[PDB]
Amino acid sequence: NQIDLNVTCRYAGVFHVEKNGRYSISRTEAADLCQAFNSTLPTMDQMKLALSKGFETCRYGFIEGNVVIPRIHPNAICAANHTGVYILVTSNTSHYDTYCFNASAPPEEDCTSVTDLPNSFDGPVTITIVNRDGTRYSKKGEYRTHQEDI
Numbered sequence: 001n002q003i004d005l006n007v008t009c010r011y012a013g014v015f016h017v018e019k020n021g022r023y024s025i026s027r028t029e030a031a032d033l034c035q036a037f038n039s040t041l042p043t044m045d046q047m048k049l050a051l052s053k054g055f056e057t058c059r060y061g062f063i064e065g066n067v068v069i070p071r072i073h074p075n076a077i078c079a080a081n082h083t084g085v086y087i088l089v090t091s092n093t094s095h096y097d098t099y100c101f102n103a104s105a106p107p108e109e110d111c112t113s114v115t116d117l118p119n120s121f122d123g124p125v126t127i128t129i130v131n132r133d134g135t136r137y138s139k140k141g142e143y144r145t146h147q148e149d150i
């Protein structure tokens with residue numbers, strides 16, 4: 001009963017979250033997840049400003065209304081060499097990573113570690129935030145409000 005959440009640097013409040021190191025988050029879980037970080041799913045505009053501040057990944061994730069990959073540098077194996085906020089158009093499947101937006105985060109690049117999940121609720125899951133530099137923060141709780149997600 002254990003969930004790893006891989007989190008990135010924030011860029012204008014926008015960060016990426018990977019559950020258990022694979023595409024495994026539903027749209028409804030993604031909203032629940034961001035709310036656990038006192039965050040929301042980014043708008044396209046929030047995501048575009050994050051991009052301009054240095055934000056890029058090589059992973060599909062939910063924002064509000066779409067599934068995207070922010071790209072700065074052209075790479076053939078990430079969004080097929082596109083740049084800008086690349087929008088997934090055609091896919092059979094519904095599970096991806098998520099982006100979240102924290103409005104209290106610094107305005108530009110914040111590559112400090114994430115040390116809490118301030119809005120998780122009571123629950124029996126060991127939830128571990130895993131930072132890129134390997135730093136870990138763990139707590140017992142839960143964040144999923146939809147039964148079909150558990």
Ligand SMILES: CN1CCc2c(N)cccc2C1
Nearest residue numbers: 006007008009018130131132
């Ligand atoms: C594949 N991902 C890439 C990103 C990432 C982060 N941001 C934190 C922990 C692990 C990982 C591994």
